[PDB]
């Protein structure tokens, strides 16, 4: 009955794609041919459920029904990894376990897409859902519809665009389990409020409430409920767009799968003119403590609503630190003899909180606007390697060039829009580093930062200093002497090889000067013109001459 309820709402094609995505997101092991028969049988069973709601065992939950077909093939433990052990349990324990198991020619593809339109389209989502178990299911349906619409720069754009949404949804699903529902709803109030400053608190709280149900369902593998609901909140915003935003007019003309994607990406609405100070009803009011005591979370959510609608220049995390500090003082102050006099200067405590990221953005953008993406990425690779030298040389290069790439697509924008762009990118790379470090732990400080509240995840990383517990391991065993293999290819693409030479030189001589390290990197870039203009013969002469210069520092 619940399966027939979802089959009727979602499209016939969209139902199929969703059950195929949900199967590949869990039993990623079974190849396309195994999963497609199960998807077909589930749609064929739901087809009967549409007609007779009581007959054929149409009464079971989507987790028992779509979790028994996922288990029929998943019988043996060898024809899957340690994930087949989940199968032994019964719902809701069964799906509780499946969650716990997180872990290529322009005219060649068209020869297979022309014969079977369905065989090519379903193949896009099968391995894209098996390669990204936490990708937003309704977004993946739109991603494939976009793919169905020259074929080299368009697919590269959709590869990079799809890489951003997958990473974004990993962060969303992570804050939900790791930091709670209230924490997600708190982010929701803030980012929605900046986006829709015209909307009254009740409409925002409606969006917060409906959006949490969407993302909670999507993370819990309730991928068919998620897409059905993401479409309903999208309809609601479009039906009541005056009560929400102005920007939504064009987004709502677009068809079903696009309509939702557009609203999500919608521009910040021109915040209502001449809004009063939050100080009046949050610091001055006689009933601040009485209203806070009444519905503590709603009063704080209202604080965030007003602060966020007025600060589209702040980060969502900054708005959360300001909400958290206000909550913290309200908690202590309401107990005091004169709560009013206690909290009367609360807003003056927000000053260092908003200064700290603005000062960091301005200090780092001053370096970016004077060094470029190469000499700024190089500078970040020296500082971030001295900070945490326990990171693997190529993983530290990747996160150094990735964190530098933030300054590139952030400093262009003015002081008014630098912070929300900087936080958006930085959060995404920090979660990609924390996901990579959780699997292979190398540093106890990185663990502390990733484990800390999502709010102060970036503040933690910025506080790090040079790890005084690192003994300069001066190898010089091929790491300090680069190979002349990339000399023959010769390209600015192989900049990672030149960068990895720097991160090994920092790790082997850590107490090196800021000018000393720039002189050893400038002499290394000059030595490349020997191997760019006796092929391997230049590497032996440059290896002996560059190592002679490094003897003047001897780290």
């Amino acid at each position: 009955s619940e399966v027939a309820h979802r089959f009727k709402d979602l499209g016939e094609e969209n139902f199929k794609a969703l059950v195929l995505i949900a199967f590949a997101q869990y039993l990623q092991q079974c190849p396309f041919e195994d999963h497609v028969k199960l998807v077909n049988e589930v749609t064929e069973f739901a087809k009967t459920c549409v007609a007779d709601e009581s007959a054929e065992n149409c009464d079971k939950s989507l987790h028992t029904l779509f979790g028994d077909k996922l288990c029929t093939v998943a019988t043996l433990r060898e024809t899957y990894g340690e994930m087949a052990d989940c199968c032994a349990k019964q719902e809701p324990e069964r799906n509780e376990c499946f969650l716990q198991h997180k872990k290529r020619e322009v005219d060649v593809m068209c020869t297979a897409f022309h014969d079977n339109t369905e065989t090519f389209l379903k193949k896009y989502l099968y391995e894209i859902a098996r390669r990204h178990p936490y990708f937003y299911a309704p977004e993946l349906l739109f991603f494939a519809k976009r793919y169905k619409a020259c074929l080299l720069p368009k697919l590269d754009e959709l590869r990079d665009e799809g890489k951003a949404s997958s990473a974004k949804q990993r962060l969303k699903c992570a804050s939900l389990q790791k930091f709670g529902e209230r924490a997600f709803k708190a982010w929701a109030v803030a980012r929605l409020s900046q986006r829709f400053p015209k909307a009254e608190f009740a409409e925002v709280s409606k969006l917060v409430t409906d959006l949490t149900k969407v993302h909670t369902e999507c993370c819990h593998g309730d991928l068919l409920e998620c897409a059905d609901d993401r479409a309903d909140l999208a309809k609601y915003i479009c039906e009541n767009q005056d009560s929400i935003s102005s920007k939504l007019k064009e987004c709502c003309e677009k068809p079903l799968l696009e309509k939702s994607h557009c609203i999500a990406e919608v521009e910040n609405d021109e915040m209502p003119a001449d809004l009063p100070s939050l100080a009046a009803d949050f610091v001055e009011s006689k009933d601040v403590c009485k209203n806070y005591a009444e519905a503590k979370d709603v009063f704080l959510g209202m604080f965030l609503y007003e602060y966020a609608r007025r600060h589209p220049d702040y980060s969502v995390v900054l708005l959360l630190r300001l909400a958290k500090t206000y909550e913290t003082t309200l908690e202590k102050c309401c107990a005091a003899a004169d709560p009013h006099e206690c909290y009367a200067k609360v807003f003056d405590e927000f000053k260092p909180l908003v200064e700290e990221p603005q000062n960091l953005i301005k200090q780092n953008c001053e370096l970016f606007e004077q060094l470029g993406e190469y000499k700024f990425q190089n500078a970040l690779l020296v500082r971030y390697t001295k900070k945490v030298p326990q990171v693997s040389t190529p993983t530290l290069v990747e996160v150094s060039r990735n964190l530098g790439k933030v300054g590139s697509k952030c400093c262009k924008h003015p002081e008014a829009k630098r912070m929300p762009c900087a936080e958006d990118y930085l959060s995404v790379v920090l979660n990609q580093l924390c996901v990579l470090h959780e699997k292979t732990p190398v540093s106890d400080r990185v663990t502390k930062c990733c484990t800390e509240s999502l709010v102060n995840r970036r503040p933690c990383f910025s506080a790090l200093e040079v790890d005084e517990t690192y003994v300069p391991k001066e190898f010089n065993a091929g790491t300090f002497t680069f190979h002349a293999d990339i000399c023959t290819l010769s390209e600015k693409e192989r900049q990672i090889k030149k960068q990895t030479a720097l991160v090994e030189l920092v790790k082997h001589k850590p107490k090196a000067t800021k000018e000393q390290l720039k002189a050893v990197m400038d002499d290394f870039a000059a030595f490349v013109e020997k191997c760019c203009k006796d092929k391997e013969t230049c590497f032996a002469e440059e290896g002996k001459k560059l190592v002679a210069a490094s003897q003047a520092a001897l780290g």
Binding site: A199, E200, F201, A202, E203, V204, S205, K206, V208, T209, D210, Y236, N240, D242, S243, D281, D287, K290, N291, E294, A295, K296, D297, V298, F299, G301, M302
Partner: protein, 122 residues
């Protein structure tokens, strides 16, 4: 000037809800600030009901501007009222949250903010 059988059902649908509100408010008066204004909104929404019931009569007398903007804001006004009763019943004695409910533009957000105040109170 359309759906006169569905307008009889539409009007009768609001009447059942106003009766539901009136019982819960008459009980409340010996069981929270909106209480005097709730009784004014009830009387004002009844004027719209009389207007509809007169429109039916006018069409029957005549040979026969389809305004749904009054109907929608009526349903949302009924929600702003019903929500304020669920909050008064919940023990919310705080004119901040009442205004937040009354400031809402949609009955959908009226209930979402209601449920939010309700859980936050516990």
């Amino acid at each position: 000037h359309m759906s006169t059988e569905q307008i009889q059902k539409r009007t009768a649908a609001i009447q059942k809800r106003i009766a539901a509100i009136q019982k819960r408010i008459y009980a409340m008066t010996a069981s929270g600030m909106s209480i005097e204004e709730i009784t004014k909104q009830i009387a004002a929404i009844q004027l719209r009901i009389v207007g509809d019931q007169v429109q039916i009569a006018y069409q029957t007398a005549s040979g026969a501007e389809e305004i749904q903007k009054q109907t929608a804001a009526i349903e949302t006004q009924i929600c702003k009222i019903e929500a304020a009763i669920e909050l008064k019943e919940a023990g919310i004695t705080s004119d901040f949250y009442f205004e937040l409910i009354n400031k809402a533009k949609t009955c959908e957000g009226v209930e979402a903010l209601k449920e939010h105040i309700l859980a936050a109170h516990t």
